[PDB]
């Protein structure tokens, strides 16, 4: 599913991301824009052999099992394919574990490089939330 900006802001808000570990909703919308273009089916190979899955590009090195990432963990206890569903529940639950890990949203490279420090409230501007 390719979410609209506001549609995704609403889903993320419904699933409890707004202010989760102190990250305002716009941080999560920004991160999803640059990680997946709001596409739940997005998959991207990393240089290390891991792959990133879904709207928040969750990595098979640590968080989900894809059967092809040596010496990885599955800390969200889920098949990576579950992170591609039109329903963002699994991606949200897994992102809550990630952002609680110690480095906050820095875990998302695109957030660090493209969202952090910026006016992230612009991403929920005009949305009925
Ligand atoms: Cl993509
Ligand atoms: Cl694996
Ligand atoms: Cl980046
Ligand atoms: Na894995």
Domains of the chain: 1-129 (1.10.530.10)
Q: How many whole angstroms separate alpha carbon 126 and alpha carbon 103? A: 30
Tokens representing residue 59 in the block: 């990595």
Closest CA to 93 of 76, 107, 111: 76
Catalytic positions are 35, 52
Instruction: Please give the method by which this entry was determined.
Output: X-ray
Closest CA to 54 of 99, 10, 87, 11: 87
Contact present, 15 and 92 (Cβ < 8 Å): yes
Note the resolution in Å, 1 decimal: 1.2
Tell whether residue 87 is among the known ligand binding residues. no
Contact present, 78 and 88 (Cβ < 8 Å): no
Contact present, 97 and 63 (Cβ < 8 Å): yes
Q: Phi and psi (nearest 5°) for 20? A: -65, 125
Within the chain, where are the H helices? Answer: 5-14, 25-36, 89-99, 109-110
- Ligand 3 centroid–CA 111 distance in Å is 7
């Amino acid at each position: 599913k390719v979410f609209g900006r506001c549609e995704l802001a609403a889903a993320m808000k419904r699933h409890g991301l707004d202010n989760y570990r102190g990250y305002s909703l716009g941080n999560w919308v920004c991160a999803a824009k640059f990680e997946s273009n709001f596409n739940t089916q997005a998959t991207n190979r990393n240089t290390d052999g891991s792959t990133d899955y879904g709207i928040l590009q969750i990595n098979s090195r640590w968080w989900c099992n894809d059967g092809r990432t040596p010496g990885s963990r599955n800390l969200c206890n889920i098949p990576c394919s579950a992170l591609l569903s039109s329903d963002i529940t699994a991606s949200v639950n897994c992102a809550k574990k990630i952002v609680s890990d110690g480095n906050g949203m820095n875990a998302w490279v695109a957030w660090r490089n493209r969202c952090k420090g910026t006016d992230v409230q612009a991403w929920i501007r005009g949305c009925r939330l």
